């Protein structure tokens, strides 16, 4: 998946620029996993980090 294919992308609450890519700029909702293709494991880590 996009997150797991690049080992240098770290899903951290401080990596605000990476986390922004997974949130809708116009509505602010976190895209569901089928939208971007991230596996359930990484989507769970992303959702927690965004919060």
């Amino acid at each position: 998946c996009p997150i797991c294919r690049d080992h240098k992308l770290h899903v951290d609450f401080r990596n605000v620029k990476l986390l922004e890519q997974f949130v809708c700029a116009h509505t602010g909702i976190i895209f569901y996993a089928p939208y971007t293709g991230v596996c359930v494991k990484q989507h769970k880590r992303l959702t927690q980090a965004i919060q």
Partner: protein, 343 residues
């Protein structure tokens, strides 16, 4: 016998069997087709199995300012040359075995949604580098001829668009698929519509139309909604530049009618400015995200009427049962609002 040997052209022409009775009326399959291999590619003039070094042909004529004499590579030296030659062949052969990753369209073996690149430049220094072409349908149509019987032809539908409102489509026909692709691509550029985009991301108003037996119902959507429509419509929308829209295709799902119907509706959509001028009234946009703030999107360039539009108590408008049924939560579908990849 030396006198019975033929040339490479004659040997490959016979061994390949490209022209025969098994390749006329779909009589032979395509899997066992063999490819020509030029056996003179890596061969050097003067190089043989004995390893002789001919001054002026295989090796340089003069070395150290003196004419070289006939020499022969040692046994071990020739083995290296022979081993290296085998390695070079394997590498060259390896290159041909490698498969380049081809970006697939709607399906692995489907032509729909594949980019054909920019249209070819005109003969008078004209260029279309901004325009992008994408195939929509590839069909093997047939006619019957007295001499040959079934005559196979290719019908190709392509759509071209620069992504800034200008987009068109055309049909190309030819015996070869390459000729069909070229004809459709180049001809589509001379038949370009201009599509009015509201804020350069969506349509101005909901469009409902019927082209022959195809029903297309498009709805205006806010930013971030995405393209939630028939895949062919998604491809055409990206070429036009529309980012957010919903569309439902009913009736016959003919690709020709769908494309011709889509371009018919998008071309006839009335802009806010065109509405204000026709009505002589301000067009005020009410957004829920902005509360009661009245946003004037268009004003009449001419004189502004002073009489308010008559407010009919009950609108005599034809409602689509499918719309009313959904607003009342009466539409249960296990296929609606399914999670899908970003479009």
């Amino acid at each position: 016998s030396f006198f019975t040997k033929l040339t490479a052209d004659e040997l490959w022409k016979g061994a390949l069997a490209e022209t025969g009775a098994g390749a006329k009326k779909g009589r032979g399959k395509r899997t066992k087709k063999k490819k020509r291999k030029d056996l003179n590619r890596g061969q050097i003039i003067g190089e043989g199995r004995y390893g002789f070094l001919w001054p002026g042909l295989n090796v340089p004529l003069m070395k150290n300012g003196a004419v070289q004499t006939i020499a022969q590579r040692s046994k071990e030296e020739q083995e290296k040359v022979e081993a290296d030659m085998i390695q070079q062949r394997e590498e060259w052969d390896r290159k041909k075995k490698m498969k380049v990753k081809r970006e697939r369209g709607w399906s692995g073996n489907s032509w729909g949604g594949i980019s054909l690149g920019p249209p070819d430049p005109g003969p008078c220094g004209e260029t279309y580098e901004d325009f992008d072409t994408r195939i929509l349908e590839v069909r093997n149509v047939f006619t019957m001829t007295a001499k040959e019987g079934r005559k196979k032809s290719i019908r190709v539908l392509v759509a071209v668009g620069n992504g800034k409102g200008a987009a068109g489509f055309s049909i190309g026909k030819a015996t070869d698929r390459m000729d069909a692709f070229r004809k459709a691509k180049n001809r589509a550029v001379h038949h370009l519509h201009y599509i009015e985009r509201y804020e350069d991301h969506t349509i101005f108003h909901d469009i409902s139309l019927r082209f022959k037996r195809t029903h297309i119902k498009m709805k205006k959507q806010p930013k971030g909604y995405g393209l939630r429509c028939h895949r062919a419509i998604i491809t055409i929308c990206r070429l036009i530049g529309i980012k957010d829209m919903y569309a439902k295709v009913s009736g016959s799902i003919n690709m020709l009618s769908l494309t011709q119907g889509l371009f018919r509706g998008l071309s006839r959509q009335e802009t806010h400015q065109q509405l204000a001028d026709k009505k002589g009234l301000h067009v005020v946009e009410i957004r829920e995200e902005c509360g009661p703030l009245p946003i004037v999107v268009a004003s009449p360039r001419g004189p502004l009427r002073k009489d308010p539009e008559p407010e009919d108590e009950v609108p005599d408008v034809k409602l689509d049962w499918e719309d009313v049924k959904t607003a009342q939560g009466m539409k249960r579908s296990v296929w609606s609002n399914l999670k899908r990849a970003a479009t």
